[PDB]
A paper describes a structure:
Within dendrites, β-III-spectrin binds to [name] filaments to form a spectrin-[name] skeleton underlying the plasma membrane. The β-III-spectrin ABD comprises tandem calponin homology (CH) domains and the L253P mutation is localized to the second subdomain (CH2). Recently, our group reported that a [name] missense mutation, L253P, localized to the β-III-spectrin N-terminal [name]-binding domain (ABD), causes a ~1000-fold increase in [name]-binding affinity.
Numbering used by the authors:
A (entry chain b), D (entry chain f): 1035 to 1167
B (entry chain B), C (entry chain F): 1 to 375
Write the structure that this text describes.
């Protein structure tokens, strides 16, 4: 009746297959975003920290769409960061990237599966929908 | 297949969604089939709007949020929320367009007809699905059990089944679904935990006492003797801790909660325990092949994850069936997940790869050909 | 913004007004919310008429003048005197016409409805305010604390609060205001200082013993042991000096005065100390998120400026809450001013810049839309 | 729990922002008043001393309004100066510049924030109200 410890092994391999996905996928995004944020001369060695503020995700959306997005207050504080990603989410819900756990705090916290879960949905609506210029 | 065309297997069972590509041994996406919706208001400028939290993030904000299964015991209640856990599945775990993939779905048998054709439709039409297949749960758990003979008892989060089989041939009249699963036992655990004074009137803590249950609450092999030694609490009592930091102690309330699987009078229905239900299935079966149903009772599902089940089973169908012969029960690991895993290997079989409901197969012919392919 | 349209943030807390333009880190205008009115007559030809001294000049002539808060614990008592400290704020510190600016006001929560709509009206109508926003205190102190999770305890000069929050979502039923602040403790200090023979029957010296209090009177970490060693006066006794030049000595009267924050029976009410009030707020909260209220108790306000508060807090909610987990308290600098500073950065956020009560929004629609925007 | 010494820093910056205001504002007044008191050939290098008597503020109000105001007794003494500013305040309360700490002694003492707090309210009622001619 040993499905429990087998669940401790399986779920470790659930997210092992998801990390083997999300890391190569993060580098798909990484060379994809450094093909774009290099227009504004920003280089990404880490999605989860560079685009963490939201304003840097705003820089990406200003590159991809070739447009301008508002840059509200930023600093140390949480509200500083959440507002910035709430403008990114303003343009991303404008681009119909839903709030299916693709969040403000998810970018601020750098949530490994939803920061990439947001911006890979940005890839799945850049080469599908008009996040491009 | 397999990151190519790559049939998406998505086990939309109650309580939990389990999804991955074809051929995957592990559903990379596992997260509760829930939608978090805020209850109290918040005046904070710059706060996640997040009207509709979905799935596993609603586990994070359980206090504010109204936790809600979009599905109920295989019957899909809320279709757009069902599409929320879907679109989150396909764009935040599977992270891919179903617009290319077949979507090997999983569904409960003896389903009213809208929950097949609309479960397929919101795939075909809101999403695009070039192909797909909604599928019976217990058979796919037999695909990970990999056998063709016996009777499969899939108690997920919502529905316990008893689905017989004999060398590929199923016995439909002998198939019996039943509402005895983890969603029910936590309500019984709710009414039986408050006799100690612990009330949890919020779904947030319904899942937490379900977590108590999925850890502590095993099945009494013999019941009223475990209640007899529930007089002297020696080991039956144990300390649990809350996310608040408070401590529970539960004694007898452990084993009697999943005894409602076996004595549903603790819930208060006509329903017999799961052992009489598989036994009742074999009442409806054929005397040649009824022997092979005894020795091959298969277990499956998330509620079947508990200790003390299968030995009570071998005891009790021994009490029920002819004990002249053998009643082995086959309880493999990953029985919650075997439903999905056997689907993830079903799509690998190329004869199944002609058994898809393709796109134009849905569009021009019907939504009723879903029923012609999925039965 | 910022000397342009430039939302005026004006923290009209009791005891002190704190005002500056949007984006300012420092409220250039800080002066006591008082109005000096002469008591004794003076026959001198050529003397400041000055019927109504206002604000910080009344600190200069405290002997002649009847010092009077126009506001009482968030509830505005005298509206034209409120307009005196306003018009002095806007023409002698901010030195500008509100006729152009939004006026981001600050007000206490759980406010009777006239103190929102009339606080807004005398702005809209006596002044002109093309826009404005009266605002809850503790949230804006969380804006300078810059967080979204925990519980904020804003004890200004008049009201202590306990305002919970969790990722932008507040819990309104768990919000508790209370009258335990610097205005109260100086009355307790008055009744407890006269046992040494020092009576100060004039508001002039009520602010001076409040100045004693805001310097000397800390919070006993443990109380009755500091009273036990108040037997042998070694360091607890200290010399203070008056503006007259006389000397005080206070020993135990130091720590026990803000013990009324923690044991309001020294005042003599039902009220528990502030630690039981935040603990009582978390009684009303949700077991998932109650953990994040423990480790994120936030401090704010002018009465919270005293030593020995926050360590007594971590001691006592440890005595109250599950000590299995952690109870950190976050007491940033400028906690009297964080209420204002977080407002001075709130107006900077352009999403807030659509959340203003504009002029015609007040005029044609209602004074009750103030309540629709400010809650 | 260090809001106290942080208050010694903050209040220094409270009035630092107020002095960066009030000095440029004093020179706003200075070139404004030397655009007017140059009609009566009085030059202002310091508001706080030149218009300190009140009679010189009376000279300004005689310029701005283009009118005549009484010049009572002046000398060394305080009453000499307070009476003069009490005629200025007579014409300024006539012009609804309130006595919200905009005082006789505030002009006589040369109070840095209320001498300018009076006469900037004179600017805020010259270009708003009819302190002009």
């Amino acid at each position: 009746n040993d499905s429990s410890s087998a669940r401790l092994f399986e779920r470790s391999r659930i997210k092992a297959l998801a990390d083997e996905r999300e890391a190569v996928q993060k580098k798909t995004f990484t060379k994809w975003v450094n093909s774009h944020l290099a227009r504004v001369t920003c280089r990404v060695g880490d999605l989860y920290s560079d685009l963490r503020d939201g304003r840097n995700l705003l820089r990406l959306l200003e590159v991809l769409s070739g447009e301008i997005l508002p840059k509200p207050t930023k600093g140390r504080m949480r509200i500083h960061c959440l507002e910035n990603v709430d403008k990114a989410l303003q343009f991303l819900k404008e681009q119909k990237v839903h709030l299916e756990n693709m969040g403000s705090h998810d970018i601020v916290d750098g949530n490994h599966r939803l920061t990439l879960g947001l911006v890979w949905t940005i890839i799945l609506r850049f080469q599908i929908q008009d996040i491009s210029v | 297949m397999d990151d190519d065309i790559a049939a998406l297997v998505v086990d939309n069972g109650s309580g939990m969604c389990k999804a991955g590509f074809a051929g995957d041994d592990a559903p990379r996406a596992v997260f509760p089939s829930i939608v978090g919706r805020p209850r109290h208001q918040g005046v904070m400028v710059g706060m996640g709007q997040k009207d509709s939290y979905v799935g596993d993030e609603a586990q994070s904000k359980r206090g504010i949020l109204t936790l809600k299964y979009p599905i109920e015991h295989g019957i899909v209640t809320n279709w757009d929320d069902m599409e929320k856990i879907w679109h989150h599945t396909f764009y935040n775990e599977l992270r891919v367009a179903p617009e290319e993939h077949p979507v090997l779905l999983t569904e409960a048998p003896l389903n009213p007809k809208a929950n097949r054709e609309k479960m397929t439709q919101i795939m075909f039409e809101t999403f695009n699905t070039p192909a797909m297949y909604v599928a019976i749960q217990a058979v796919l758990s037999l695909y990970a059990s990999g056998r063709t003979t016996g009777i499969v008892m899939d108690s997920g989060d919502g529905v316990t089944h008893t689905v017989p089989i004999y060398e590929g041939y199923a016995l439909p009249h002998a198939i019996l679904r039943l509402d005895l699963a983890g969603r029910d036992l936590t309500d019984y655990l709710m009414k039986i935990l408050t006799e100690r004074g612990y009330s949890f009137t919020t779904t947030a803590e319904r899942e937490i006492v379900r977590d108590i249950k999925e850890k502590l609450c095993y099945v009494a092999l013999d019941f009223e003797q475990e209640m007899a030694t529930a007089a002297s609490s020696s080991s039956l009592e144990k300390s649990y801790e809350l996310p608040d930091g408070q401590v529970i102690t539960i004694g007898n309330e452990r084993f009697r909660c999943p005894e409602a699987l076996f004595q549903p009078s603790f819930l208060g229905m006509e329903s017999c325990g799961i052992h009489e239900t598989t036994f009742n299935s074999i009442m409806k079966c054929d005397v040649d092949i009824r022997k092979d149903l005894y020795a091959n009772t298969v277990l499956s599902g998330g509620t079947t994850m508990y200790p003390g089940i299968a030995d009570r089973m071998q005891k009790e169908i021994t009490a029920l069936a002819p004990s002249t012969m053998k009643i082995k029960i086959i309880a493999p690991p990953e029985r919650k997940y075997s439903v999905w895993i056997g689907g993830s290997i079903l799509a690998s079989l190329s004869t199944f790869q002609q058994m898809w409901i393709s796109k134009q197969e849905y569009d021009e012919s019907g939504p009723s050909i879903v029923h012609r392919k999925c039965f």
